[PDB]
Design an enzyme around this catalytic site. Structure first.
Site, short mmCIF file in Angstrom:
data_model
loop_
_atom_site.label_atom_id
_atom_site.label_comp_id
_atom_site.label_asym_id
_atom_site.label_seq_id
_atom_site.Cartn_x
_atom_site.Cartn_y
_atom_site.Cartn_z
N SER A 94 0.85 -1.19 0.00
CA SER A 94 0.00 0.00 0.00
C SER A 94 0.88 1.23 0.00
O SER A 94 2.04 1.18 0.43
CB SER A 94 -0.89 0.04 1.25
N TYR A 113 -2.93 -0.26 10.28
CA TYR A 113 -2.88 -0.63 8.86
C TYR A 113 -1.52 -0.25 8.27
O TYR A 113 -0.85 -1.07 7.64
CB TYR A 113 -4.01 0.06 8.11
N1 LIG Z 1 -7.40 1.92 -1.46
C1 LIG Z 1 -7.36 0.63 -1.68
O1 LIG Z 1 -8.30 0.05 -2.15
C2 LIG Z 1 -6.08 -0.13 -1.30
C3 LIG Z 1 -6.11 -1.49 -1.03
N2 LIG Z 1 -4.98 -2.09 -0.68
C4 LIG Z 1 -4.92 -3.47 -0.40
O2 LIG Z 1 -5.55 -4.18 -1.41
C5 LIG Z 1 -5.97 -5.41 -0.87
C6 LIG Z 1 -7.37 -5.71 -1.35
O3 LIG Z 1 -8.08 -4.50 -1.46
P1 LIG Z 1 -9.60 -4.36 -1.71
O4 LIG Z 1 -9.77 -4.89 -3.06
O5 LIG Z 1 -10.03 -3.01 -1.33
O6 LIG Z 1 -10.18 -5.25 -0.49
P2 LIG Z 1 -11.65 -5.86 -0.31
O7 LIG Z 1 -12.12 -5.59 1.04
O8 LIG Z 1 -12.46 -5.38 -1.40
O9 LIG Z 1 -11.46 -7.41 -0.47
C7 LIG Z 1 -10.58 -8.17 0.34
C8 LIG Z 1 -10.93 -9.63 0.36
O10 LIG Z 1 -10.14 -10.20 1.38
C9 LIG Z 1 -10.95 -11.12 2.08
N3 LIG Z 1 -10.49 -11.46 3.44
C10 LIG Z 1 -10.54 -10.75 4.54
N4 LIG Z 1 -10.02 -11.40 5.56
C11 LIG Z 1 -9.63 -12.59 5.14
C12 LIG Z 1 -9.02 -13.80 5.72
N5 LIG Z 1 -8.69 -13.91 6.99
N6 LIG Z 1 -8.78 -14.79 4.92
C13 LIG Z 1 -9.07 -14.72 3.64
N7 LIG Z 1 -9.65 -13.70 3.05
C14 LIG Z 1 -9.94 -12.61 3.74
C15 LIG Z 1 -12.38 -10.62 1.97
O11 LIG Z 1 -13.30 -11.68 1.99
C16 LIG Z 1 -12.39 -9.93 0.63
O12 LIG Z 1 -12.93 -10.76 -0.36
C17 LIG Z 1 -5.80 -5.30 0.65
O13 LIG Z 1 -4.57 -5.85 1.06
C18 LIG Z 1 -5.76 -3.81 0.81
O14 LIG Z 1 -5.31 -3.33 2.05
C19 LIG Z 1 -3.83 -1.41 -0.54
C20 LIG Z 1 -3.74 -0.03 -0.74
C21 LIG Z 1 -4.89 0.60 -1.11
#
Ligand SMILES: NC(=O)C1=CN([C@@H]2O[C@H](COP(=O)(O)OP(=O)(O)OC[C@H]3O[C@@H](n4cnc5c(N)ncnc54)[C@H](O)[C@@H]3O)[C@@H](O)[C@H]2O)C=CC1
Ligand SMILES: NC(=O)C1=CN([C@@H]2O[C@H](COP(=O)(O)OP(=O)(O)OC[C@H]3O[C@@H](n4cnc5c(N)ncnc54)[C@H](O)[C@@H]3O)[C@@H](O)[C@H]2O)C=CC1
Lengths: 255, 255
Positions: free
Chosen positions: A141, A154
């Site tokens: 991130s 985070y």
């Molecule tokens: N602004 C943003 O959207 C940014 C996102 N990221 C990183 O991108 C990654 C994904 O982002 P998004 O698409 O927004 O997330 P999201 O919330 O849309 O999806 C994340 C997925 O991870 C799953 N999850 C949660 N805990 C879990 C566990 N213990 N075991 C397995 N699966 C689990 C959820 O079911 C979900 O399907 C994360 O690491 C996030 O921190 C990083 C920087 C910025």
């Protein structure tokens, strides 16, 4: 022609939504076999039905549990015969200042964002070492490079991701296992939209406009724009890259 | 299918050899129109004959001269009708410690590595502003992130490249002109082999073996492995990336 992801097996954590799901789509589109490890069984099965693809497999997985991580790795090997790429993409966010944050909340963030990455990587690496090659891609991130306000746990977790990425790169380069990370800025995903409403005043659209004003490109990133960085890192195109971070943040950290 | 570089016009400085030439090959291979701006007329014409491609054009250019930089930009616009991507790749290295280095030698390094990048970018940007879009890719170096021994002027110049990259990214994001850089480690090119012999003891093959060992991947990079990063940065795949540096160094800066 040059991506060369046909018949590569790619295990994506948190693949059932947001960036993870866009990554599923992108990799399927390049003829990779994809295995999604996600805690949300309903959303995972829904994904399987919508995509309706031989090359896709879902395995329910809580990455905070080691047995489940091993099982996810084994599921990839059983289903498609191997494991070429691990994408540690699952992560969560809890908003709380350090002086008020509950230990249980601190641990929930670290366990998914960092511990789970360790556990998935541990078991993937056991297989990749035996196979003689591999690729690990971590979802870091902007928060791993600078501090986002109000989400210290985070940011800390993503600092951990950055250095874990580099550590594994250095320790496993001799075994031809490349390890890199992508550092997304603010991405427009459904889950993020919930965070926007909870932590800012105004309508969703008003908050989106404010957020899309903090980036020099004047817009939020799309999930597929991060998925595309993952394609690059998984492919042979990035063959001389290991231990590096690719920033995709619309210019945010450049100023 | 996803690179989408067909009919994009790409102007590459220092394109007549090493990384630049590998970039010519990679971009031609993706159906881009390529214009090479290089000071070496003989080597440039030789390149044209070997490649024998309608999509390739050579224009002799000394990037330390502003008129020649403008002329190179105009050559791209006349020949192929526009200019979508500028790759500022030309650079030189002179080995000398600060306490002994001649001012004229300091200036020769800075003029090609940094001033020329400025001058090429100046004139490319005039056109890209008018066209409403653009992409600039700068060849930085591991030397822009950490110090290579014994080449302080080179390192300094590449520090300049890094910040110029970020500066242009921030100032021109509002006009949808993305600006990024690649930071290569040690690449096996003919001109780098000359540097190996001049500045180390042993045979060429012995020196190559020593240099390979300082990277966690235990090998030198190939020119095409940097060219491939340039393809990524030029393509829409990297659409949410600006002001960023992609390191391709076999793990060198990770430790
Ligand atoms: N602004 C943003 O959207 C940014 C996102 N990221 C990183 O991108 C990654 C994904 O982002 P998004 O698409 O927004 O997330 P999201 O919330 O849309 O999806 C994340 C997925 O991870 C799953 N999850 C949660 N805990 C879990 C566990 N213990 N075991 C397995 N699966 C689990 C959820 O079911 C979900 O399907 C994360 O690491 C996030 O921190 C990083 C920087 C910025
Ligand atoms: N090879 C390595 O280990 C590393 C290379 N780089 C950078 O990659 C870039 C290309 O590297 P190589 O391919 O090895 O270089 P090279 O020496 O093979 O080729 C550079 C090209 O630039 C041209 N050039 C020199 N002075 C010029 C001028 N005034 N105007 C126009 N053209 C001029 C040369 O004639 C040549 O065709 C350079 O900026 C270099 O500093 C960066 C880090 C490491």
């Amino acid at each position: 022609m040059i991506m060369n992801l046909t018949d590569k097996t790619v295990l994506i954590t948190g693949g059932a939504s947001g960036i993870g799901y866009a990554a599923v789509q992108a990799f399927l589109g390049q003829q990779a076999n994809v295995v999604v490890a996600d805690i949300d069984e309903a959303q995972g099965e829904a994904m399987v039905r919508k995509e309706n693809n031989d090359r896709l497999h879902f395995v329910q997985t809580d990455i905070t549990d080691e047995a489940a991580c091993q099982h996810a790795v084994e599921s990839a090997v059983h289903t498609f015969g191997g494991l070429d790429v691990l994408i540690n993409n699952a992560g969560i966010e809890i908003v709380a200042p350090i002086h008020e944050m509950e230990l249980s909340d601190w641990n929930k963030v670290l366990q998914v964002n960092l511990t789970g990455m360790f556990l998935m990587s541990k078991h993937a690496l056991k297989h990749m070492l035996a196979a003689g090659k591999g690729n690990i891609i971590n979802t870091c991130s902007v928060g791993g490079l600078v501090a986002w306000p109000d989400i210290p746990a985070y940011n800390a977790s993503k600092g951990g991701v950055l250095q874990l990425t580099k550590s594994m790169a250095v320790d496993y380069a001799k075994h031809q296992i490349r390890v890199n990370c992508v550092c997304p800025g603010i991405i427009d995903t459904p889950l993020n939209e919930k965070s926007f409403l909870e932590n800012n005043e105004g309508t969703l659209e008003e908050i989106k406009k404010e957020k899309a004003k903090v980036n020099p490109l004047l817009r939020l990133g799309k999930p597929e724009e991060i998925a595309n960085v993952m394609l690059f890192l998984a492919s042979d195109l990035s063959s001389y890259m290991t231990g590096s971070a690719i920033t995709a943040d619309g210019g945010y950290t450049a100023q």
